[PDB]
Amino acid sequence: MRRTTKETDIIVEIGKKGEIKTNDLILDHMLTAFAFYLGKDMRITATYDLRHHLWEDIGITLGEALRENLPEKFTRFGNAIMPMDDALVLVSVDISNRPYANVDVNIKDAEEGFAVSLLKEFVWGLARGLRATIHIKQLSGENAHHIVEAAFKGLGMALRVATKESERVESTKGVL
Amino acid sequence: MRRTTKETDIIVEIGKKGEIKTNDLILDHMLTAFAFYLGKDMRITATYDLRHHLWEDIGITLGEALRENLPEKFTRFGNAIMPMDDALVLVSVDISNRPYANVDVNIKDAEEGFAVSLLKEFVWGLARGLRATIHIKQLSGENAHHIVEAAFKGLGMALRVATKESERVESTKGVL
Amino acid sequence: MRRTTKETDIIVEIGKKGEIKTNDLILDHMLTAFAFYLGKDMRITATYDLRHHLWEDIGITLGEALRENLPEKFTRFGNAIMPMDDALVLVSVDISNRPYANVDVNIKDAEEGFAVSLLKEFVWGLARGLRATIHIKQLSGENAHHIVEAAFKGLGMALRVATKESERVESTKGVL
Amino acid sequence: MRRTTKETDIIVEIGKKGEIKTNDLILDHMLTAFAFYLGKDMRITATYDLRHHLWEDIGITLGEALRENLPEKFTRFGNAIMPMDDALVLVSVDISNRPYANVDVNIKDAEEGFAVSLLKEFVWGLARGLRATIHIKQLSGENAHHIVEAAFKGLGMALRVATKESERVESTKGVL
Amino acid sequence: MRRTTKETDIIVEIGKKGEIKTNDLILDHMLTAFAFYLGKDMRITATYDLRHHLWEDIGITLGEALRENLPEKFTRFGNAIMPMDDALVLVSVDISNRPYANVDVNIKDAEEGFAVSLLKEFVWGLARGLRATIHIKQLSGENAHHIVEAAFKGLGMALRVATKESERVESTKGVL
Amino acid sequence: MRRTTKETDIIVEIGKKGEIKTNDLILDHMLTAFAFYLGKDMRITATYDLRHHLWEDIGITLGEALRENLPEKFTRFGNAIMPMDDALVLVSVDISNRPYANVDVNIKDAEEGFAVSLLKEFVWGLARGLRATIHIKQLSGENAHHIVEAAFKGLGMALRVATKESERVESTKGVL
Ligand SMILES: O=P(O)(O)C[C@@H](O)Cn1cncn1
Ligand SMILES: O=P(O)(O)C[C@@H](O)Cn1cncn1
Ligand SMILES: O=P(O)(O)C[C@@H](O)Cn1cncn1
Ligand SMILES: O=P(O)(O)C[C@@H](O)Cn1cncn1
Ligand SMILES: O=P(O)(O)C[C@@H](O)Cn1cncn1
Ligand SMILES: O=P(O)(O)C[C@@H](O)Cn1cncn1
Ligand SMILES: [Mn+2]
Ligand SMILES: [Mn+2]
Ligand SMILES: [Mn+2]
Ligand SMILES: [Mn+2]
Ligand SMILES: [Mn+2]
Ligand SMILES: [Mn+2]
Ligand SMILES: [Mn+2]
Ligand SMILES: [Mn+2]
Ligand SMILES: [Mn+2]
Ligand SMILES: [Mn+2]
Ligand SMILES: [Mn+2]
Ligand SMILES: [Mn+2]
Structure with missing residues (x-):
């Protein structure tokens, strides 16, 4: 899942072994925790201008990626x-x-x-x-x-x- | 399970495909929710005088029906x-x-x-x-x-x- | 725009001459006000179980109808x-x-x-x-x-x- | 419009397509918003010592630029x-x-x-x-x-x- | 529009170039402001006993004059x-x-x-x-x-x- | 697991059929509850001077016993x-x-x-x-x-x- 604006460019790929590298070490740690406890490998890369835009747009793109990955019938x-x-x-x-x-x-x-x-x-x-x-x-x-x-x-x-x-x-x- | 007084007459049948029809649309919705998340079909029918008597007596009858259906050893x-x-x-x-x-x-x-x-x-x-x-x-x-x-x-x-x-x-x- | 669930069945048709008839006279009046000040005719019909489901689902359906009608570039x-x-x-x-x-x-x-x-x-x-x-x-x-x-x-x-x-x-x- | 002190050197040119680059990414974003909603292209460049001096002097220079651009009779x-x-x-x-x-x-x-x-x-x-x-x-x-x-x-x-x-x-x- | 009582005598003529002269310098200034921002010339003259009667009766007469000038269908x-x-x-x-x-x-x-x-x-x-x-x-x-x-x-x-x-x-x- | 000081002498043996006998009937009941809901038999015996020393040292010994029994990779x-x-x-x-x-x-x-x-x-x-x-x-x-x-x-x-x-x-x- 990719989402690109004039502020941020984010890729979130669930189920692919890869790095989590957003250029924000705090968010990288938080997302590493998130993925570990979700129980799924993911690759996340981002560029951004301001940290708020990064955090929000990561949330949006991760959400969209999770939504795309859902089975038809889910818990x-x-x-x-x-x-x-x-x-x-x-x-x-x-x-x-x-x-x-x-x-x-x-x-x-x-x-x-x-x-x-x-x-x-x-x-x-x-x-x-x-x-x-x-x-x-x-x-x-x-x-x-x-x-x-x-x-x-x-x-x-x-x-x-x-x-x-x-x-x-x-x-x-x-x-x- | 049937429970009848001079105020209410209630039937609750767990495991039976059927209607939930109490003559109170709010309670019908709440009981539909209850049964769905319990994970059981049930048939519930009621007549009543006052809504309080309905809600209470539905609770009693539903409780008695759940109790009757419990295995000897339960979680x-x-x-x-x-x-x-x-x-x-x-x-x-x-x-x-x-x-x-x-x-x-x-x-x-x-x-x-x-x-x-x-x-x-x-x-x-x-x-x-x-x-x-x-x-x-x-x-x-x-x-x-x-x-x-x-x-x-x-x-x-x-x-x-x-x-x-x-x-x-x-x-x-x-x-x- | 038609939206149908087990709770409600709603039609909102923006730009169409018609009545606003939801089976809730308060909501009919509120929607008449909304449409008049929007400056559009609309046809709205609904059936519902509970008023909350009606008001929410009218909101959803009206929102989706407005979104469908939005020009590509909007104010x-x-x-x-x-x-x-x-x-x-x-x-x-x-x-x-x-x-x-x-x-x-x-x-x-x-x-x-x-x-x-x-x-x-x-x-x-x-x-x-x-x-x-x-x-x-x-x-x-x-x-x-x-x-x-x-x-x-x-x-x-x-x-x-x-x-x-x-x-x-x-x-x-x-x-x- | 240019304004130069020993603290800051700012150029604001209204109506010219160009970059907004103040060396403060937050201010660049805020000024991008300002110009977009004003409805005018502008070129803004700055050097500065301290962010307060930048924000204030940007405000002054932008104000002076807007004042210079006003018609004789304005709303x-x-x-x-x-x-x-x-x-x-x-x-x-x-x-x-x-x-x-x-x-x-x-x-x-x-x-x-x-x-x-x-x-x-x-x-x-x-x-x-x-x-x-x-x-x-x-x-x-x-x-x-x-x-x-x-x-x-x-x-x-x-x-x-x-x-x-x-x-x-x-x-x-x-x-x- | 003229309104006369034993307390006040007021003329308000909207659309007429003329003086605003109520014999109250504060009210003359306020009405000058009102007319300017309304975007209409008006002639207003008054005699009065007490300032309260002036201010109220000016409001009434001005309101009546505005009402008389409204088109059949207004915003x-x-x-x-x-x-x-x-x-x-x-x-x-x-x-x-x-x-x-x-x-x-x-x-x-x-x-x-x-x-x-x-x-x-x-x-x-x-x-x-x-x-x-x-x-x-x-x-x-x-x-x-x-x-x-x-x-x-x-x-x-x-x-x-x-x-x-x-x-x-x-x-x-x-x-x- | 045996832990012995000059104050207390405690045995906690997880997975062993046996009694829970600490010479404190309240603690015996609490530990019976703990073991039942853990889902393990255990044998616990204790001697002690003061109840605080008992409760603390039972905690320590039970904790060490649980740690000893933990699989290499645990939930x-x-x-x-x-x-x-x-x-x-x-x-x-x-x-x-x-x-x-x-x-x-x-x-x-x-x-x-x-x-x-x-x-x-x-x-x-x-x-x-x-x-x-x-x-x-x-x-x-x-x-x-x-x-x-x-x-x-x-x-x-x-x-x-x-x-x-x-x-x-x-x-x-x-x-x-
Ligand atoms: O040890 P874990 O598995 O909980 C992961 C650590 O990052 C937690 N943590 C503790 N203090 C600051 N961070
Ligand atoms: O989406 P837009 O047009 O309002 C521009 C964004 O920068 C707004 N924003 C939302 N959260 C932080 N900034
Ligand atoms: O007279 P309008 O055009 O504002 C429409 C009325 O329904 C308003 N209203 C006044 N009291 C209760 N409702
Ligand atoms: O959509 P669901 O499955 O949670 C069932 C709805 O009745 C819930 N609800 C939301 N607002 C009022 N009721
Ligand atoms: O200058 P303007 O056009 O706003 C008109 C003045 O009377 C306003 N004013 C400022 N202080 C006291 N009065
Ligand atoms: O009946 P159980 O299985 O919950 C065990 C009882 O000791 C609980 N209890 C209730 N009052 C005081 N103790
Ligand atoms: Mn940490
Ligand atoms: Mn922003
Ligand atoms: Mn935001
Ligand atoms: Mn009661
Ligand atoms: Mn009304
Ligand atoms: Mn509901
Ligand atoms: Mn709701
Ligand atoms: Mn300052
Ligand atoms: Mn003034
Ligand atoms: Mn008065
Ligand atoms: Mn007890
Ligand atoms: Mn202690």
Whole structure:
């Protein structure tokens, strides 16, 4: 999946062994966590002007890539509760075709490179590209890196469950 | 399972392909959700005088029907965390033989047909008929329909887990 | 544009002389306002189970209908400030391909048939179907009908501006 | 229009196709937005010592360039209300010959490169170079980039209106 | 349009080149502003006993004169956002045939001759004579003269829009 | 696993049919719960001077016993949400090699033999002996016995998941 604008140029290829190299070492780490806990190899390359555009557009392109990869009938729902030392983060996903994100974190000890702005824009991008409902709810924690990385691990774990093949269309209304 | 009083007359048949028709369109939708996420066909028909009596007595009868269908040795415990757009609802069930319900929701945007009274009385009815401990804990949300429907989806998912056969009596005291 | 689920069956036909008949007299009035201030005839018909499903699905279908009718190059942005007696409501739209809604109203004098739940679900449906950013911000007011009707008038007026043909792709990133 | 001090050297040429290259990627993006929504090509080049000096002196030089470009009789007033996802920003301009700026924003989620100091100094610079009254009033929002970029888009849109030719001197006192 | 009582005698002639002379220098200035931003010449002369009676009765007579001059089918709605140095004032008009005024200002630095009483009574008079809904909402400001003059400029600008000819009766109910 | 100091002498033998006899009937019950929900037989015997030393040292010894039994590649993460009547307790474990415990309970109705001191010291002992991150987070509840027993049931259930064999080293850093 490739997405190109005048701001960013992003390639996300799920199922291909390859590097994750976005030219942002924080995002590279977060995406490495995401892919590891999703349980899939992926190749991700990006160029960008501003980090916000990178994080958001990575989210969009990753979402679109996940959507393209979905089986016809998929499990739809997946959750994860992820600890990382002091951090404890609930991640809940519904591949609902109703884009929505709610990211509720409370970072006490900030860390350079980790920003709520960037986390939120990645998650909104992902929600919009995948066309999904995504909740990130911090239950405990203080450290920025532990909170944000737990969220990315959790997204991977939750989507591992939600993107699995199902025997039915998982909606009482008969369509998503 | 049939339960008849001077107020209501209710039939719940689990495992039978059939209609869910209670003469309350909101409850029909909630029960459709419940059954879908439980993963069982059911036929439910009711007549009633007042909606409270309907919701409670449906809970009792459904609980009794679930209890009748349990294997001798069952998993006992099941949880679900269910998102619906803004709503995020935790449902926790223990088929404990200790009737108890705790329903903790916070509806900001009310909706006609959706009432905490009716939800609580359905859940207490279910707890009493099944003979179970049931928690409904809203983690996030504003919209009445999203919150209540998430609760019914969650009850279905949780009971899907809790009602499966187990290799042992699931209690250290040796009996339920 | 026809959209059909097990819950609702909706037709929205923009540019066609016809009636607006949803089987909800409040919504019929709101949509009549919307269409009048948009400056287009439309035919709308619906069947539904529950009013929430109606309001949301009308939003979705109307949004998709507006998206289908959008010129290749469109103005993208449109605003309205709409008074109705005590009410004064700001509506701001960006046809951004970034679904988002923020509805901030404060109804002091409630009115049967008018609910924040239903307004919010219509607007989120519209945002998701059109793929747009939509703000509704009450500046003044107390009366439910005045506030909500002002919002619908304002959506029509704002979308009248935003859906007009433009000479260019209205984004510095080169893509919408 | 060129302005040179011991701190900065800035060229702003309105109506010339060219690059916007200030050696600050955030400002380049903001100025690209400004020019796009103004509806004019411009060439902007700068060297600078400190970013504050750049932002302020860009504002001054851009203001002077806009002032030089004004027709004899101009519309004087222009407004914009600009959404960007969560952000909603009102921009109001009066080319009054009374330099004044009031920038009222509330950034909840900060972003590296985006600072209220720099926004305010650009706007004051612009107000002083153009000789104008400028209000930036955040109505909604949390994200720094969305708020600041909406302000720059809004300045462009507002000045598009205010700098258009008029049939009269737009003041009851007979002069500006 | 002439209106005579035992308290005041007022002539308002729209479209006539002429003096604005009410024997109140503050009101003469405000009305000069109003007429300038409306974009019409007018002749206004008054005698009065008390300033309140003047301001109110000028509003009534001006409203009646505007009403008399309306085309059969008129635009109905008009808004303005007007800055004046520190002041930023929103004016919203609906020629609704439902008299109503809401004037919400917050003057920090008072000025002799400028009073909320007089502004409010002019606006209510105008609403009653024209038969219109009028909102004046201060968004920012401290100085009495800047706030009140912005309101009069804004009323002129808003009514410039609202009083233009339209192709239709601008109401879904088919009549005003 | 035998651990002997001048204060305590503890045997924990996982996978062995035997009794749990610590000379503290509360701890015997808690450990019976832990083992049952872990899904393992175990033999535990202890002598001790002071109950704190017992609870802590049981934690340490049990943790070391679990660590000894861990497969080379293990699942690492496990969670449980456990109801017991009024109580609802979240337990989250990461076998991280980063000892940490956070126990957040709120006992309203105290019970002899049940103490936050002792619970916390058992959990910290377990965290240190296993070399793990352990969160215990009360979501609801009042009764001391229900809260504490839910925590022990939850630890068993969570560790059942976390101690299972995996196909890989469960860390992006390549080392645990
Ligand atoms: O789409 P699904 O499968 O979640 C079922 C819908 O009834 C949910 N819903 C969303 N808004 C009101 N109800
Ligand atoms: O009945 P179970 O299997 O949950 C085991 C009991 O010890 C629980 N309990 C209830 N009250 C005090 N303890
Ligand atoms: O897409 P457009 O036209 O609004 C231009 C983007 O730079 C906006 N943006 C959104 N998030 C950060 N920047
Ligand atoms: O200069 P203009 O056209 O806005 C008209 C002036 O009367 C405004 N003003 C500024 N301070 C007091 N009055
Ligand atoms: O008169 P219009 O054109 O604004 C349309 C009316 O429905 C408005 N309204 C006033 N009160 C309740 N509704
Ligand atoms: O050790 P793991 O597998 O959890 C991966 C690490 O990056 C986590 N981490 C801990 N502190 C900062 N990052
Ligand atoms: Mn963004
Ligand atoms: Mn890390
Ligand atoms: Mn009852
Ligand atoms: Mn529903
Ligand atoms: Mn909905
Ligand atoms: Mn109406
Ligand atoms: Mn400065
Ligand atoms: Mn941007
Ligand atoms: Mn009076
Ligand atoms: Mn003046
Ligand atoms: Mn100790
Ligand atoms: Mn017990």
